[PDB]
């Protein structure tokens, strides 16, 4: 329950590791107390410990670039990467797939041995020509590098520059080979820099865009189940004009137009803080962080965004809060009495392990443990404030550690990814997917909170959990 137990539990679990892994894993587990202070992150994964982490290709193709809908993204390399990630993440978009949008499609060079020996650059140029005859309405091409691209001495940048100038088309080389970095984290950074060097500056000397004092861009909202659409409505009801969404339902033109906005609203810090810092240096555009999980954080974030403008936007902000007040209050009234006091454990990626705690507490729930796959030290600094004392914190948790932590703490609900869902459902612990929203959502904004509360209730209080044991042992 607290302090000496949780820390004795941590040494309890680690006694099974070889010394090398034990010493390294010890530094990634810690107990909270609201400056690295108590835990390291963003380090190598110990081999053979069943990590949940993905690669840098996942962080660049599946996360940042994939959602851009009017572009064609090519998985450059063997056929595995693009296939396992085809339509795996529910970053929603409006469009005619195969004609002017291509998110859920899988374009690949499908490497054979002939291309590992000879290189795959000549094929890539030939691929780009085939793409252009068959998909004339694509507004850009990105080349996501898979593991073999770097190890064989290929140069995708020269192909991109030559074919790009030939076809007068933006062609984005991205060196997001899976062996780079320690996780999806470097994938974001590689992808951010690839947006910078090849897309973001295309309209720097263009002056035709009619700006306005309320122009704004949403950064780090990938529209999981319409999450970015549940956020946009609230901002435009506040009087703002949202020029772009990165990258959920986003377009190439929305990215190119972002340097014209007055404020960059960063939802996901871990994956987009790189391009935000560059846009403040190059274009002087300030950027702030916000949180649209639950009514508390959303109301707090709406007011903080309005303060950056004039009294009109601040007076609309209070009209919006008042309009949705009866709605989210009815949601809380109906579902909090069913979820009050239930303890939840979380393990997600780089933002949500902390960003959803406010939503859980609005329903009266308590996060007794959270953790990130690939977060950095500045992510854990923000996490310290959002969680109580004596709560468990884990970085790059192992399958064994996670299972062991859940057995001792006995949380009432777990929120994580697909590679953990079926482990704990068999253990009798209700489980919600906090990546794909368990094919439900959206969870952002006020409209998302209603779904969120409904989803946590239906699973926690489902009758199926009472029937795990046979009435005869």
């Amino acid at each position: 329950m607290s302090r000496e137990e949780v820390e004795s539990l941590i040494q309890e679990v680690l006694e099974v590791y070889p010394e090398k892994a034990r010493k390294d894993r010890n530094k990634h587990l810690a107990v909270n107390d609201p400056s690295k202070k108590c835990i390291i992150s963003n380090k190598k994964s110990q081999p053979g410990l069943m990590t949940i982490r993905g690669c840098a290709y996942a962080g660049s193709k599946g996360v940042v670039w994939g959602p851009i809908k009017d572009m064609i993204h090519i998985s450059h390399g063997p056929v595995g990467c693009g296939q396992y990630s085809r339509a795996g993440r529910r970053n929603y978009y409006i469009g005619t797939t195969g004609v002017n949008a291509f998110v859920t499609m899988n374009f690949t060079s499908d490497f054979q041995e002939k291309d590992i020996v000879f290189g795959g650059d000549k094929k890539l140029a030939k691929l780009i020509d085939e793409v252009e005859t068959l998909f004339p309405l694509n507004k850009g091409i990105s080349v996501q590098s898979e593991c073999p691209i770097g190890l064989i001495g290929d140069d995708i940048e020269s192909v991109s520059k030559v074919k790009g100038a030939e076809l007068s088309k933006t062609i984005v080389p991205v060196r997001c080979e899976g062996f780079r970095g320690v996780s999806q984290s470097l994938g974001h950074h590689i992808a951010n820099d690839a947006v910078r060097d090849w897309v973001l500056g295309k309209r720097d000397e263009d002056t035709t865009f009619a700006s306005t004092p309320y122009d704004v861009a949403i950064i780090g909202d990938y529209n999981i189940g319409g999450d970015a659409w549940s956020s946009r409505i609230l901002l435009e009801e506040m009087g703002l004009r949202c020029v772009a969404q990165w990258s959920g339902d986003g377009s190439i033109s929305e990215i190119e137009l972002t340097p014209k906005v007055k404020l960059n609203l960063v939802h996901c810090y871990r994956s987009m803080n790189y391009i935000s810092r560059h846009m403040e240096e190059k274009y002087g555009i300030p950027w702030m962080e916000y949180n649209f999980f639950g009514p508390t954080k959303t109301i707090e974030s709406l007011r903080a965004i309005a303060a950056k403008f004039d009294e009109s936007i601040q007076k609309k902000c209070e009209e919006v809060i008042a309009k949705y007040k009866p709605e989210w209050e009815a949601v809380v009234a109906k579902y909090r009495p069913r979820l009050e006091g239930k303890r939840v454990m979380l393990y997600i990626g780089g933002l949500r392990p902390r960003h959803v705690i406010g939503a859980y507490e609005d329903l009266g729930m308590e996060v007794v443990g959270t953790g990130y796959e690939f977060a950095h030290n500045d992510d854990y600094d923000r996490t310290m404030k959002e969680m109580g004392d004596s709560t468990l914190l884990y970085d790059d948790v192992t399958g064994y550690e996670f299972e062991e932590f859940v057995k001792r703490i006995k949380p009432d609900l777990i929120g994580s990814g697909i590679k953990e869902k079926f482990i704990f459902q068999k253990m009798g612990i209700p489980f919600r997917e906090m990546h794909s929203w368990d094919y439900s959502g959206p969870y952002h904004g006020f409209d998302g909170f209603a779904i969120f509360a409904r989803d946590m209730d239906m699973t926690l209080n489902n009758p199926c959990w009472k029937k795990l044991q046979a009435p005869w042992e």
Binding site: G48, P78, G98, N106, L134, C147, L151, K419, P442, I451
Partner: protein
């Protein structure tokens, strides 16, 4: 806006008027969208035959493939052995994808590790990762065996698996007797089924090669069954069920049936059942070895015939009526056990069902795709029902296989309008179903976007999908089905006939229009 009376998820939430106008302003203001009438004209062009000609000239671009990479199959083969951890030497992202892919299809846990080869291993080799990885996995998850495959990273830099494992035992990272078989499973060669063949052949030689002197064929009086890359739980169980009814001693080598179907009883079981190491050591003593899916077990065949000295029978996959018969007749010949009356009746029951349903099956035109053995058995069964497999597609098929299937079609009038495609993908298929419209598709969940494209062209061009294959993500528990044997033939027949009938009912439900054919009795 949300009514707490009836909460709305993404659908149909974003159909409310206030969300609709917003997405319209987002489009008009910042998306630089092509005019809708251009998008329509282009979409129409993509359904034409001119586009198909362009589509089939592709040499370098692959769109919507119908295959995965080798290590995926190596993981699945390894999960079928008792208390073994599939171990993929290479970069960790692959393993995260391998588990996810299988989690979503089987809706079950899928345990698999990596040794997380990174930037440094690309220049110095992954020998250190293999040492600590094997030691970490063995102490943490306590498996009795560790089956090693590779990612395409580890293959490009040329890591020698045999030495890396041996030097892990020499230096005391794992005991010298701890079983650690291995296989090079390069993602740029073949497909996921090759990874199954490579892994199994590697596990076989580990227990068999340096011990053949004590082996005599047939002394254990059993038949070895190698299922191959199999993702239907019923298929493993129907093989064992029929072999038990025949009183035939058998060894199903690679049996993941238990681990992919553990009960939910308040306890997680990482391992469950599977082929024990003792059966793998005794397998050379069998009467013979049967390959349920020989077209992606050729490496294993050559090892079984060459080293075990087993005369592997030439058998097609036991799919359909004739091939299930030849399978049972071969098993009878090898084991000496006669085909029992229970299987004779079951065959007859499948025949009775074909007679009651042949009127609705006759002449129906099907496009289909999948792995080579699964596709040719489905093609064979379709012909046995009087159906026309119009478009037959196998991305990971070879030309020797295509000639085998082309001869099956030639031996039947219902294969006259049939063409077999190799090295093509579902974007190729999307054209074939537009320009040479079949009645249905039979494939995995990826075909759902082809049906969505046909419907956009119009209701009269929609080609419904029949989900038989791998992976199946948008339905629940179809992985429990069966496609092998008579039982698998009955489920498929039932699925085919009723999909046809549900489509007729939908087309003839128009009140005072088409419901004149909305018959109660069909």
């Amino acid at each position: 806006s949300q009514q707490v009376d009836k909460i709305k998820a993404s659908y149909p939430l974003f159909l409310d008027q206030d969300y609709k106008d917003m997405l319209a302003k987002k489009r008009d203001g910042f998306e630089e969208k092509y005019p809708q009438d251009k998008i329509d004209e282009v979409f129409q062009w993509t359904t034409t035959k001119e586009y198909q000609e362009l589509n089939f000239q592709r040499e370098a671009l692959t769109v919507n493939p119908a295959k995965a990479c080798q290590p995926l199959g190596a993981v699945l083969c390894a999960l079928g052995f008792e208390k073994t951890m599939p171990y993929v030497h290479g970069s960790q992202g692959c393993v995260a994808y391998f588990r996810s892919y299988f989690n979503r299809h089987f809706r079950e846990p899928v345990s698999c590790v990596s040794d997380s080869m990174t930037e440094d291993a690309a220049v110095f080799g992954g020998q250190q990762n293999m040492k600590d990885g094997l030691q970490n996995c063995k102490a943490t998850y306590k498996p009795d065996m560790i089956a090693v495959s590779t990612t395409c990273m580890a293959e490009v830099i040329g890591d020698d698996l045999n030495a890396f494992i041996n030097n892990s035992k020499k230096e005391g990272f794992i005991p010298d007797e701890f079983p650690v078989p291995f296989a090079h499973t390069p993602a740029f060669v073949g497909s996921h089924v090759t990874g199954w063949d490579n892994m199994f052949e590697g596990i076989a030689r580990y227990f068999t090669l340096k011990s053949m002197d004590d082996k005599v064929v047939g002394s254990n009086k059993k038949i070895n069954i190698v299922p191959g890359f199999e993702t239907y739980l019923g298929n493993f169980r129907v093989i064992k069920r029929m072999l038990s009814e025949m009183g035939v001693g058998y060894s199903l080598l690679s049996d993941p049936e238990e681990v992919l179907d553990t009960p939910a009883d308040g306890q997680f079981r990482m391992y469950a059942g599977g082929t024990t190491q003792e059966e793998m050591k005794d397998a050379p003593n069998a009467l013979n070895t049967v390959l349920l899916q020989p077209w992606h077990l050729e490496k294993t065949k050559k090892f079984v015939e060459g080293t075990w000295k087993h005369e592997v029978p030439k058998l097609n996959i036991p799919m359909g009526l004739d091939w299930t018969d030849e399978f049972l007749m071969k098993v009878s010949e090898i084991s000496g056990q006669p085909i029992p009356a229970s299987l004779t009746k079951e065959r007859g029951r499948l025949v009775d069902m074909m007679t009651d349903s042949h009127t609705w099956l006759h002449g129906k035109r099907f496009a289909l795709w999948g792995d080579p053995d699964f596709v040719m058995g489905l093609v064979k069964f379709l012909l046995e029902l009087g159906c026309e497999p119009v478009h037959i597609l196998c991305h990971n098929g070879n030309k020797r296989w295509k000639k085998a299937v082309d001869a099956i079609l030639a031996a039947s009038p219902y294969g006259k309008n049939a063409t077999v495609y190799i090295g093509k993908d579902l974007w190729h298929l999307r054209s074939l179903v537009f320009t040479d419209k079949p009645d249905f598709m039979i494939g995995n969940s990826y075909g759902k976007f082809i049906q969505r494209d046909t419907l956009h062209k119009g209701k009269e061009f929609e080609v419904p999908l029949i989900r038989i294959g791998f992976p199946i993500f948008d339905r629940h528990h179809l992985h429990r089905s069966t496609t092998l044997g008579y039982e698998g033939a009955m489920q498929i027949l039932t699925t085919l006939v009723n999909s046809i009938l549900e489509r007729l009912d939908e087309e003839t439900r128009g009140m005072q229009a088409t419901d004149y054919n909305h018959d109660l009795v069909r």
